[PDB]
């Protein structure tokens, strides 16, 4: 293992990207403003806030964020980049070794299901397979601390409500989460020498919804920004983002749960970071510089 951890390495999608796609896009997407400095929200994302809670003075020197907006598990224009390629990018730059002193974080899958693909069960199968494959690869290359996050109920996104896909998006979310729990249970039993951490985003997001006003949200179905999506634009998270009309963004968004048709606002990312930190503290995870 590794008693105190010295950094966080995150693999994920637009829920975790801290500006990687924005840089490659020459700052043209996500347009900022109204997005915040290339994050897919109007403030820093959860994993940045988590890193700063442990390393308040120089959090970015303790966070290696390989998440790109539009990333998912391969199942090809649907996906900007794959989990496998994010992991292999980390490995390439680290001499094919996963540091035993890093907290590896995997939050992926939402981009696959929100593309509303036509093959339901094959998509579920291949997302689960791709996550298991990347976990096994990290373990094989020396990882000793792995945090896996499941999905919120994607049927709650404004996208699902507007497009009439609530049932399908909730089904993907629930089936994905059930399979992912089985995967994590398998790895826990097989690799007791690795620290396995799990965050039940599904239950936490439902709790936020059920108590939305108490968490600070006055609107859970609308969007701070405004997008106009066609039929061939409904096909992907990145198309929805590109279709934001910046001049029509609301000026006062402190009460919205959703910044755009799928992405949560800054306050939701803050809540997520706070709950993740409490989970890690309960588990006894310790960081140090
Ligand atoms: C522990 C805090 C509970 C609240 C969780 C906050 C996260 C909100 C989730 C909204 C749906 C996100 C879908 C984004 C699209 C994608 O990642 O491809």
UniProtKB/TrEMBL annotation:
UniProt xrefs under Pfam families: Lipase_GDSL (PF00657)
EC number(s) stated in the UniProt entry for this protein: 2.3.1.43
Keywords, alphabetical: Acyltransferase, Hydrolase, Signal, Transferase
Disulphide-bridged cysteine pairs: 224-253
SUPFAM superfamilies: SGNH hydrolase (SSF52266)
One Gene Ontology term of the molecular function aspect: hydrolase activity, acting on ester bonds
Name this polypeptide is given: Lysophospholipase A
